[PDB]
């Protein structure tokens, strides 16, 4: 898949963010990561402890604030246009499972981000791997760091939307069978 003529739709995933803001993008996803089955079960427990002592009609609780980290939950965050910007993984085994993700984004004008490893979108969240993280509404503690992240990333994916969809990858020959093609223009 380096030799062949990679179509301009699958090429999209081999032009990922650089390590410059990729760690920053993993910084947000990490601190807005979901609750780890232990702060989840003791969160909805204070939804009874301070409700059983409550008089009535007051148990109201929700997820404090996190990033949409599933896949069909992310997709709805895009279709709803409620995901402020989405992060996408470089590689997933059935590649078609996220192939269309960076294309319904500029359909709904969400800033998307193809990032270098799904194994690094898992460590931040908590799973092993993650196909795509969506970072929806955030608290004013961190509107500064992402408002730039959206800018640092659409400068790489939305600003490039025209050249992306016309971009045939691959055709990268060997160092053995293309230094040979260097030693013959040396014979010229």
């Amino acid at each position: 898949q380096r030799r062949l003529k990679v179509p301009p739709a699958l090429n999209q995933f081999t032009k990922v963010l650089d390590r410059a803001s990729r760690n920053e993008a993993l910084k947000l996803i990490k601190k807005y990561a979901p609750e780890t089955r232990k702060a989840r079960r003791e969160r909805l427990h204070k939804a009874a402890e301070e409700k059983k002592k409550d008089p009535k009609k007051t148990v109201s609780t929700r997820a404090p604030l996190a990033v949409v980290t599933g896949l069909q939950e992310v997709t709805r965050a895009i279709e709803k246009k409620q995901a402020r910007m989405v992060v996408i993984a470089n590689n997933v085994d059935p590649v078609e499972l996220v192939l269309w993700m960076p294309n319904l984004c500029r359909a709904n004008k969400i800033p998307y981000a193809i990032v270098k490893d799904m194994a690094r979108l898992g460590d931040a969240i908590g799973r092993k791997t993650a196909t795509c993280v969506a970072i929806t509404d955030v608290n004013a503690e961190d509107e500064a760091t992402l408002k730039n992240l959206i800018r640092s990333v659409n400068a790489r994916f939305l600003s490039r939307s025209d050249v992306i969809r016309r971009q045939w990858g691959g055709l990268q020959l060997s160092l053995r069978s293309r230094a040979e093609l260097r030693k013959k223009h040396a014979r010229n």
Partner: protein, 63 residues
């Protein structure tokens, strides 16, 4: 109405098949009285020949 959007965003990255590509090759340079002879032999029936030959000329005014 909303599923149709899903079939035009998935029809955007994916592009056209070697039929719809080779059909609009005929339909781009006359050959329309036979573009449906192509998209009938290839595409099975003849009622779905028009609904696609009519859909590639409706894809040509939208270059």
């Amino acid at each position: 109405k909303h599923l149709r959007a899903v079939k035009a965003i998935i029809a955007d990255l994916v592009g056209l098949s070697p039929l719809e590509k080779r059909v609009q090759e005929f339909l781009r340079v006359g050959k329309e009285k036979r573009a449906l002879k192509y998209c009938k032999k290839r595409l099975g029936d003849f009622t779905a020949a028009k609904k696609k030959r009519s859909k590639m000329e409706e894809a040509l005014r939208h270059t």
